[PDB]
Amino acid sequence: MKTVVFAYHDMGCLGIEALLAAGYEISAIFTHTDNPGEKAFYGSVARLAAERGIPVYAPDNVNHPLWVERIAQLSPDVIFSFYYRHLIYDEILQLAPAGAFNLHGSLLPKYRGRAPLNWVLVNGETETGVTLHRMVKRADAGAIVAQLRIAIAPDDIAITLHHKLCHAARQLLEQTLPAIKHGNILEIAQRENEATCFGRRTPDDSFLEWHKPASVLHNMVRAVADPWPGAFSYVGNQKFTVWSSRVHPHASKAQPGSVISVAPLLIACGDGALEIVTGQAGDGITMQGSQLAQTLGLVQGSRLNSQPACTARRRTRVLILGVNGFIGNHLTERLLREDHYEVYGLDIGSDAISRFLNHPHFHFVEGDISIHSEWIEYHVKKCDVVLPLVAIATPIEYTRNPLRVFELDFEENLRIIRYCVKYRKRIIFPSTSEVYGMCSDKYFDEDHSNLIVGPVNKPRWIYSVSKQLLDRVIWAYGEKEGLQFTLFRPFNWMGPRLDNLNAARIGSSRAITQLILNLVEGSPIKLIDGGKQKRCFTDIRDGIEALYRIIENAGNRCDGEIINIGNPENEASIEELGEMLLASFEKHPLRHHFPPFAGFRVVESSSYYGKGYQDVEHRKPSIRNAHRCLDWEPKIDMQETIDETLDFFLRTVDLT
Amino acid sequence: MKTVVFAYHDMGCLGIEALLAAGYEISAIFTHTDNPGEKAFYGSVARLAAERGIPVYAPDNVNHPLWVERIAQLSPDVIFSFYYRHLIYDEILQLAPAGAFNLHGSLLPKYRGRAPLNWVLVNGETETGVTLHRMVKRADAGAIVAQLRIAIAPDDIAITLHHKLCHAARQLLEQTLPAIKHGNILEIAQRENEATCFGRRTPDDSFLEWHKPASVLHNMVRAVADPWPGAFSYVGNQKFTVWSSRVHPHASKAQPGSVISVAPLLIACGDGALEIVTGQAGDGITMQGSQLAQTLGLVQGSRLNSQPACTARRRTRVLILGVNGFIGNHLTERLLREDHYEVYGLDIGSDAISRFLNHPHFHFVEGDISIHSEWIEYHVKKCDVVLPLVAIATPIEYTRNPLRVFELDFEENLRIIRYCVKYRKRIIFPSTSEVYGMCSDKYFDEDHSNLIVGPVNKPRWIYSVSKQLLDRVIWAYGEKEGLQFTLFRPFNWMGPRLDNLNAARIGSSRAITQLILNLVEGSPIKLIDGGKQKRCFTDIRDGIEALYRIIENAGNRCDGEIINIGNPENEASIEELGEMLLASFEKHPLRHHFPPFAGFRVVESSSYYGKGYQDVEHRKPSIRNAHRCLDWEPKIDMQETIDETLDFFLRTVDLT
Amino acid sequence: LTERLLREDHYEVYGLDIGSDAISRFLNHPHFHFVEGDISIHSEWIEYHVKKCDVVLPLVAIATPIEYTRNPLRVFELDFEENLRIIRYCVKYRKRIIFPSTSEVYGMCSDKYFDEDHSNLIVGPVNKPRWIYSVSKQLLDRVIWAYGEKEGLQFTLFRPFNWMGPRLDNLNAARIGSSRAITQLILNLVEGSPIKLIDGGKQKRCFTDIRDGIEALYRIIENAGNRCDGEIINIGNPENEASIEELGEMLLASFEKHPLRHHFPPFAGFRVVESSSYYGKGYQDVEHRKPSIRNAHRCLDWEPKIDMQETIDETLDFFLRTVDLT
Amino acid sequence: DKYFDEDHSNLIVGPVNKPRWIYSVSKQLLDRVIWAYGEKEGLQFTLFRPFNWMGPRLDNLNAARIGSSRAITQLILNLVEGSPIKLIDGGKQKRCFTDIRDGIEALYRI
């Protein structure tokens, strides 16, 4: 009596009708909200089910343990599924403790993804059918119960196909239910020995390249025929779609280029001859080929290029606003190793970018974010990617002048962001790792962590709250006004361009400079017992690689994300008491090389352990969106970073 | 080739199937893509015709004189129509001696309106049908040939009834094609003269009223049944669509809102009782009443918020720039006579709107479009409809100094236009009748006439070109950035409160004012050698009614449109105008007003006109988009307008 | 606050607002000077009257709970940009500002008692578009503090904790603002409906009568001995804690005393015990809402006096007597 | 007009719904504001109309469709690619071309 059915389309509707005729009460149906606008040529299942009285639930929190307990309490005995999200779910894979039956309409276990029947028709196969198998913990690890073979008629039409599908469904439902119910499944094993990936299911968008065989073109044109999105191509300033063609006897000795008939439209290809019956003018309806053939006026000898090269991918012009900064220069020296990239910048110097003088693609104006507002106004109109990598906030500055962390680090950025919304550009806004403040979470996740700041009377959380509100108004702009954006959070990046030189008296600014002075100046301070702090550092190379992948945006899958770019696994307790420095102090020169002394007085002098100025827990990030939207994972460890930094810093002071 | 067909919708598709099956060779069908056609069914026509290789045509815009000439030059004798809306019938049908045949889907001629299915189903009749009829000099007054009878049942649903109607129509066509081919139709004289006009169907009046009987509710629920969006109210914070009902004892004594039983959900009403089995919450899932009731945390007994439906009516705010002018102060007196209108305003004076300053919703703020630009920016952001009725373009002004007509009538209007494109607001921009210039068309068409101007050395065409380019900028903004607009062209609006220069631009010529001023004293009515100027005038009442209909946008029929508001059939020369003016001036009193001695019979004086050497003879508006989009036709004749203007001038002269 | 100021002689009020619906009693006062308008196009008026007056109160707060999730650009541009503009008029002309902060700056603060000098402010991740209001107001307070530290700006910040009383209709409460606890319950009371349709005593929702809060704000305005400048004062009732069910019970008990004509019949309605798919889905946030009056009891010498029963009677009297069918 | 006179010929354009005349009108209002400026502000100007200037070193092949619709460029493309020239209506339509070296000697004289 207890049975769960996920039904869809006409076969699902008739299955529901048959089950009600037999009188089995479906336990529960879990479906999602219907899309507002879609080609709904089928009937409305939800309304019919409501008339039948079957309850419908919409789980807001499928991750919730409560709903899992509910599903367990329901005691799922027998579940049938009919094209419901193909392999039901992916992340959980636990909803089938006793197993379930999945009916698929493709050649399992290969051809993974969406629209499987269309894709197997793309390759031009003459064999289809249905595959039933048990649902276990490992995906596609159930033996095929039965697999019938139905021939694909060369002249098959849609109505005959519908009648054949109905006949097959009737044959299945009439007297095959007892066979499945009895338990004649002989599952032993499946695959698990080859595991050979053919092509990793390359999308290849929908470009109609003529180099591709004409047979494949006919196949996917029929596959994407009505009702489906269909092929959509555009050459020059004119777009065209191939909506309907009929196969014709392909010639071998055809003498391509000799058009003997323009009506109907017949052009030559790499192999064979395709006869396109009807197509659509894009901004209209289906039209006969002969009229378009007469309208275009093409004559023998005219060759259609395989790629229009009208807009192509242009240049992907990138606009940086901190191009002389650490990240600003390390990203400029990486974007210029490619070909499809233009770079800009308006920092207040060119000391770290003197290397780039007259490369094919680079520009430099050397202005100010406040004074030079028209240049930025026009350059968030010409470019397509904006990286406001500019910020003037010394840790001291929150006490010297807290209003400089607002009028410059919040309002200039706010003005820049309002440029990307009035021109509909993309902005990769650099957030900070201080937004979380003193979050107690072990892993500073970017999606479900609580940003904790101090009281209003502490004049040091204005930077963190300013950046947090900047991210919030970026998110609101993105989700209300159609702003493509991507926040990214650097996590203690360390490269050999950290603070240039100490000309600006940055020695007493922060301990990050005392680390530099540790190796050169005589500093008898090495006996720190870790400080109970997990100093997670990341090399600049990995961060720049991640930022490059963010800029690439492979398939528009980095939009509206808050990726953190760090190395949560590369921790270092006080540089391992100088272990690698013991191996790297030998180098080559002997000047200034003297063995250090020893001694330890107090931990208090080194670091501050106050109430207001304290980061509770540690600073280890959580890279989850980085591993998905970039498929990126850190490779460089602390040793190479330390030696490279020391070597570069030694070379940047020459001799004296 | 004969018998071209205007078909559309699924009935049109099946009629195409029928004519193809019968062997009747029709080579031309008319259909419209209909972008606002977001119905669940795509309703695509001629697909099978395209697949069969039949050469068909797809003419989108029939009213273009090119298509008219092509469809007229072959001179056919039969034009078939099958559920083709957008009638706007014209001379093309009158050309054919045999006329045209149109198939209406209701029992003509009683209560035809628009969407006649609602009209026939609201009255709870027991028999409906279709009617193939002729075309006449009137609108939708074709003779009935036969009356189909298949009857209706309360249990019968929309799907079954529509399928039966489709099959019956198929058989009817298949058996009557010989009948129409051989004619012998016996149409009887119809009673079209004694009919009912001036009434339409609007969804806005379909609110749920408890006092209506259960019969009317049952009727309009079945009328809007599936497949259709549904007729729903707007209660506080819960959506529901009436899908199904069950006949229950019509004796609920309790007041509306009381739930008699929760399984199934049955509510009480003022009369009868509706049983809502299921409801659709907006765009999600059509789900049952009980589960929805338990989902929203409401219990049995929860009454509804009486007659107020949440927030009914919002009082759309109209931002009129130039309220003290001739059109601004006549429109305000018209918008303030109704509800749901919260008029705003800004001009340099309030001498003519002095009667609205104490109105609950007038909000007049004195200012100038230049100095007070932030006020305009804010009020274009808060309001909904913007009417820039500011004119500083006296002919003397833009001839003596065209730089002002540029910096004021192009650069100030362009700013207001660009306010509505960033705040996404509707703008009804007043164009001018001067755009056509020296056009050589009898009727100045809004979509087909050419705009002719003189050479650049003539600075008298700068105003016309400036306004024409202003229309081309608005048109390009609603085609590239989605801007809702409606250009209207005042064609010689005449009425009271027409000052000398204050209404010489947005109003009309000073003719009537000149003769009245010369008539209050003994000055003559001296004519001109070209006294037969043949000037057509429009009453301010008719123009304001048309502009109010434009503001309403009843069914989004005025969107992206250009409408001339004029009276082309109100032609009158200066002599006739003077005759009627004198006749109305003598009237009953005949006293004071000075002796009206006037008249001259030579008045040659050779010539004294320098810029009068060129004059236009074609100045007739083509009012068809007005009677296609707002269904407006001028009513007031010239004598009434003359009398009203004279009476206003004589009572408001304020003399002794 | 205007009616409290216009009874104590030496006070010249200058009010700006879009309408005079609830202040019709003061336009005939010799020292009221009301002006009709909105703060988007009155920049000159506001600037001139900041330069002219001595104390400035930007009580203009347009923050609907729905507006937190709907088009929060409006929330940011009206509750942060105009407030920022007004704050910078008070540093140009060296004027005092009494800024209304919000009790929502603490957010999910774990502390039982919300201290304004020691407690932490906790907010959710950036993806949830509901905390933009709290962060905007917190940044406004931090900017005011920075201005009163670097520019010598005389300021005071006050945080209201669920003030209730007569005339609470404006745009938050009342029929128009149906998204509210008290007004929805009282509307369900007025019209015969199943009152107390809840499945158990909810969190203790403390309320403060408007009279005590207005007294505290008046003492802030007085600035006796200048011991209130440079402070953040919490104005609330940490002792008037009451659950929703207890509130309904006491309101019904007060109704029982002189129930007019017994023309409003209360009712009850049963609901599914399981309450599957309901409001509670992880929005517990905090369960205390306890303010700290330790700052209002040291700077204002203020201690709340009016208890819950008098507040309920006052609000009910106003609601049932001032309005009628229209 | 048979001959496009610079001070007597009338300028005719299509309706607003035809968006191809927005370039003719934009450049026609620019000549009417230069004329207006030269009458009330004493601006020294000269408005030259190059009709069909054609010559060597024209626009290079770019991201658009062979630069622009230039008629002659289509013919050169057909000659280079060996495409037969489509004789539409047998070449009845004429075109009056001007050499760049001839119109440049007039621009320099201006």
Numbering used by the authors:
A (entry chain D), B (entry chain C): 1 to 656
C (entry chain F): 331 to 656
D (entry chain B): 441 to 550
Task: Please give me the paper's original passages concerning this structure.
A key resistance mechanism involves the addition of 4-amino-4-deoxy-L-arabinose (L-Ara4N) to lipid A, mediated by the bifunctional enzyme ArnA. UDP-GlcA subsequently undergoes oxidative decarboxylation catalyzed by the dehydrogenase domain (ArnA_DH) of ArnA, a bifunctional protein that harbors two distinct enzymatic domains, yielding UDP-4-keto-arabinose (UDP-Ara4O). Subsequently, UDP-L-Ara4N is formylated in an N-formyltetrahydrofolate-dependent reaction catalyzed by the formyltransferase domain (ArnA_TF) of ArnA, forming UDP-L-Ara4FN.
The hexameric core is stabilized by extensive hydrogen-bonding and salt-bridge networks among the six DH domains, which are arranged symmetrically in the center with threefold rotational symmetry. The six TF domains are arranged radially around this core, each tethered to its cognate DH domain via a flexible linker. Importantly, the map resolves the previously unmodeled interdomain linker between the DH and TF domains (residues 304–314). Taken together, these observations suggest that the flexible interdomain linker (residues 304–314) provides the structural basis for the observed heterogeneity and serves as a molecular hinge, enabling interdomain motion and coordinating the movements of the TF domain within the hexameric scaffold. In contrast, alanine substitution of Arg472 in the DH–DH interface (R472A) caused a significant decrease in activity, and the triple mutant ArnA(E407A_E411A_R472A) was nearly inactive.
